[PDB]
Amino acid sequence: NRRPKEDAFTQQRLAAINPVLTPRTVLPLYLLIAVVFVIVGGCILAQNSKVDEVTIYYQDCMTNATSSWSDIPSEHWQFVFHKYKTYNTAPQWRFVDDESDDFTKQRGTCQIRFTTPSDMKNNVYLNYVLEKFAANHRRYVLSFSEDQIRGEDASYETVHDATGINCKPLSKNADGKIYYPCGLIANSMFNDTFPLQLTNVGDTSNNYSLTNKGINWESDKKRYKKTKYNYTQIAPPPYWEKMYPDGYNETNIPDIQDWEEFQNWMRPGAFDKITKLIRINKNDTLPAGEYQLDIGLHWPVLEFNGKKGIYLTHGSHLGGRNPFLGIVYLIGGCICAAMALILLTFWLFGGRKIADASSLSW
Amino acid sequence: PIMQYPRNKIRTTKYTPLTFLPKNILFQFHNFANVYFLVLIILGAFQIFGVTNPGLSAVPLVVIVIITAIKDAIEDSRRTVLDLEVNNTKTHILEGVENKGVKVGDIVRIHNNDEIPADIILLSTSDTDGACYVETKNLDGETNLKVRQSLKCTNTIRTSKDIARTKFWIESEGPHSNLYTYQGNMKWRNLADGEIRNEPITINNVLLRGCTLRNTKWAMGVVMFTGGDTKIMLNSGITPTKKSRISRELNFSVVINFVLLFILCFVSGIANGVYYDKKGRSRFSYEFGTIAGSAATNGFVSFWVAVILYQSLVPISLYISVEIIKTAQAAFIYGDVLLYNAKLDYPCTPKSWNISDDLGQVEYIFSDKTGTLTQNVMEFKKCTINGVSYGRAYTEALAGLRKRQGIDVETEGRREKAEIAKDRDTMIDELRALSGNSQFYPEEVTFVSKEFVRDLKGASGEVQQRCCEHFMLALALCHSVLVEANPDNPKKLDLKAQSPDEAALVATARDVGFSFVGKTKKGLIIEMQGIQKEFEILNILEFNSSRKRMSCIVKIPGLNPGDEPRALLICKGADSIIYSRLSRQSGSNSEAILEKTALHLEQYATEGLRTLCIAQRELSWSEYEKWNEKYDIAAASLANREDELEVVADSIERELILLGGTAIEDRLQDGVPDCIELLAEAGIKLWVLTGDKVETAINIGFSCNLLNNEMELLVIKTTGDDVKEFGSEPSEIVDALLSKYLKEYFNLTGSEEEIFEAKKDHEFPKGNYAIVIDGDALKLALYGEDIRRKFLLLCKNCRAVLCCRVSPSQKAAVVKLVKDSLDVMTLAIGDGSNDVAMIQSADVGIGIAGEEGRQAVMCSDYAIGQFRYLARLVLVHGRWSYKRLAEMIPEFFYKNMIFALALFWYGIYNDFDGSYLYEYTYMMFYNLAFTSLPVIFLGILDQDVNDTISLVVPQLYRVGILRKEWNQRKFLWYMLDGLYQSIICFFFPYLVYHKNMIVTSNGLGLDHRYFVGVYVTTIAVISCNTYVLLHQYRWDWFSGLFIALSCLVVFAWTGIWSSAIASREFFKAAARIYGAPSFWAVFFVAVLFCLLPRFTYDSFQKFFYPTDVEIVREMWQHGHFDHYPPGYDPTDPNRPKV
């Protein structure tokens, strides 16, 4: 007896809320969405109007500045303070060469001296902006070793594995020894040493500190682990050999776990603007006045006509200052309230009414 | 080994389970959308095309390869476990201790009434020297008892104790696949004596496989040799499968998806040639130059890296996604109880699973009748003998109910009043039933009680008494009806015939007194009025539906003693064939009786009775013995399965003396209420193709209300039916007469034969115009060039086309004409072995399973219980499976390019060097697990209206006849809707990073490109799955769950894979991204801008250009369908009122 089963699934009689888009459910729906996104779009422009940031580029402290306090191109600096009180004043910078490190392409010390009229809140972030740095190509971001990130004393053919990330450009030095951080990512690290303080020059000289601990995520110290090599078979990468001039001692091998500004650099930014954290200060609210950063220039940004800068901010809940998410929720409010208005004035003032049943075949 | 004998299974499915896998894998890559994945796997192993996880590239392919393998496993198992339990299900005993299953050299005993899976070479049986009868029904139209005269020499075996003393089989040559031939001969060596003997083995000594033996016992002989020596292994079994329009308008849509993929790689392949000849870039100092060499051919490699990058654009889960939906929609056609025939134990049986959407776009139903539309239990007689009509009926004299009064029940009591006055007095010397609903026509036939003692024969007068008795004896001798031993009440034996017509002639001749008791080995025995006369039928010629000659040549005895006994020829056929074979000039009264009886044939077809008439020539044996030699040499000829026996069965039927005609009735299948307002008010144009005549088919189209009143019955009606052999070169009549009103009926529909302005047009034509073209008026209409178009355009602007399509080549040629010359779906529902030519030459193949499963069911595309279920099969289970599968296929090319273009818009910002954005698990689980489930449960569980309301308003099927759902104008505007949302799902995640690259609330930075592809994928998954939510009707608990589960699987694979250390760069992204409120602010507002164009446009359509299926759904929510119950079947015999 092959009768088919009758248990409301081979008979297709499920729950079936059955939505019909009548104009008394769509027109309250657009009244519901557009009354949310003009309150969310207001509250995001309420929050993000109150964000204070400092963007100052310094790729031409080496040439376009003197040893005295020098010219300030307005192409470089961008203060965004919501109390427009000291916004047109210029941040000046000098240049201290000292002619000892004989590199002549990026050397010396640019000492930017800016001025913050308002007070930031307790968290203060000192980023660095690297525009026009091509950080996202095919050969570039697939050049490191994951085991050397995870603290492994790998061999020459185990940094040449087929699986994605290897170190095919940076495999060995002249005498056949492997590199300790291999691959073009760790080779191409931002050098410029920011100091651990913002010196409070001019006024009172009670300095404002900036810790370099707590920079990466603290949860990232489970795949960055200390080395296990034998201090002889590793070489520094060929663009690090002027911070490790002799090679590796028994005591100069960098612990990549706590060296947090290296952990940021092994996380390549997606686009041709790169903004990574290098100095934080969770403890102290920054007071108003005039501060000075002493940037040790080492990283070349002139062979590709790029930029290099400083992003000082107090990052809000959305992160940074961007007027995008305030405009977009208002565009979400402006279109939904217009599509409600177009589909109501074509309804009551001409158009159709849902009053018949002889529209299909009459 | 040397004798080359391997063993084989019986049925020849090419997917042998030892060679299942390598033949499937080559078949999987005849598709050119997964052999494209074999290119980007072997290019993912070469470690220059920037690819991480090279072994995870065979995950999104081989999962689809194995799911198609277990799909093809189920599509091989159902073709062998449900339709094919006849391979080996019986094992014969074959005991040899005193020294359905296959063995070469076996000596198999075959009893009566069983099918033989062997090529048995007969030896002997219970009859005289191996006289074997057979019903060879599953080979040809052979419903005879074909004699298989076995070896007349070795008839000495009786049991399996003496034939079991020889272990021997013969050697034969290769196969030939011809039915009537057998070129094998056996030679054997007798024991203890040197007698050599070649027993001659011909087609009379053997019988084939697919036939059913009758009337004999212990048929014995030898099974075939291995290979293909069975003559049904090649004549039938190699059938080409079929696919839909949407499965043929898909291979255009795939190539349009490959045109776009070839452009997005070509734009990428040149923009990284333009990038690698700049001078002031960053790739000179930090990244090391001369990657491959000192040329700019690292933009040609960057072409190939975009091919590997754009692998979620090639549709891999397409040809598995249609075959999950086509299978599940067909297994819902199967598993419906309202398509289950309780009186037969038979649900709907989908023979072809892959054509569930053909039932939503059909326009022409070629439903020929008398098997399909009717009940085919032939009852009445309404006898018309000697130019006078004896019979009174009011069961169906109601075909002319247009002009009569309200109710007439007193004549239905007067039928019963004459019924009790007819059974009692005719019970003189008859021992049959003769009761209520045992006899069939109440008519006082001449009041036969005249002789008591004075005379027995008469021969003085009252010729009407003789002419009625001579009619009934010639009626009960011209038949192929078999008696049968009645198991309960064995005192009344019954009748069994393969034709429901032919059984009714004897069974009422039984009721008047002329019944036949049985059949002897040569002649026939018949109990005519007490005495049992033995009419020796020495020869019969069979019946075919292409000839309409049921004719026996039964020999009668000479009434005077001492003569040569003459013979009759009762050529019982149609009411136009034997009038085309009738003696015109005569010394008899065979002229003035014709206009009496042919007037009654018009009277007894205009009330809805099937007519079949009886003629008889009084031939002698001075002329028969040469025709019998001309027939038996033609019977000994090679043309016994051809039409050269027809020219021998033509020469003796040239002149005839007409006896009379019958008017057997046929009530309906009660497939009336579907044909009125369900299956013809939808928009489908029915085409009945009877083979019965014109007056009976017009007056049955009114009865089922196929054609109602106010139908302009523009009958074609040619006037002459003659064959041409010479002359008529300067002028023409018999072809020019129908040709001049194929133009003259173009005053009703003004058109011309030149151009097809109607191939590009679909409508259910205003103006009724039921064409009643008939028989030879169709043979002279599809003759050659430039004659079809001047009525095929007339047959487009009709609503019904009608009868007399006999000799099924015309039913083949009509369904081929309206399918080829107008590219549209046909349906062709039929039953019976003469309608397989109409079913196998159409698009859909619906078959009716009657009491037995016939060849138009086992060579079909579906099978339903009655015609009553076609209104549910087409208007519900086909209209849904069109609007489901024509909604799924635009949604699947949409979902592949909301994703695979969002890593093209990232290609601008890495200058098209081919860096991945999606971690290579979100590119690998996207076609498979992320958002490939709600597209499936859109194609399986979507219903625009309920199952009852698809039959209350059947004109919702017009969205499928017009092809007003699936077209390329729908296909491109979903890809343009995807390419819109690819900009939204990338540049809303991009324009929060482009300002200062900081998105976290604690400033720690999510600048990495794998941490951007979670902003992109979560917008590309949720705004994909909510899009499918807004494009299904009736959100249920099931598909509404697998949207809430397929959105909460991208939030769950991000939590359990960004918590392992195996995710190298993607270590802990569940805590970093989802803790950041910039994710949940760009997720709630870039899901909006993906839906907001389509949701307003599908609110601007549904308010001011609303479809017919929106207006019905507005009536669903209000009190317009409150009176209809659930599970409502309006074509049901016993149902309540609305």
Ligand SMILES: *[C@@H]1O[C@H](CO)[C@@H](O[C@@H]2O[C@H](CO)[C@@H](O[C@@H]3O[C@H](CO)[C@@H](O)[C@H](O)[C@@H]3O)[C@H](O)[C@H]2NC(C)=O)[C@H](O)[C@H]1NC(C)=O
């Ligand atoms: C980080 O600082 C170093 C120095 O403190 C920057 O200079 C790079 O230093 C290496 C080693 O001194 C230079 O390699 C040299 O290249 C010349 C040919 O250009 C070759 O003749 C020498 O024998 C030696 O191999 C390298 O050119 C120099 N500059 C660059 C752009 O790499 C370095 O630029 C700073 N940045 C990075 C990302 O390392």
Ligand SMILES: Nc1ncnc2c1ncn2[C@@H]1O[C@H](COP(=O)(O)OP(=O)(O)CP(=O)(O)O)[C@@H](O)[C@H]1O
């Ligand atoms: N066994 C039989 N004896 C005498 N006449 C028969 C017959 N079988 C069929 N006929 C006649 O042949 C004519 C056409 O033959 P056909 O094969 O069409 O029968 P039919 O139309 O009833 C079945 P179908 O409708 O599927 O063609 C009918 O008018 C019928 O009267």
Ligand SMILES: [Mg+2]
């Ligand atoms: Mg039929």
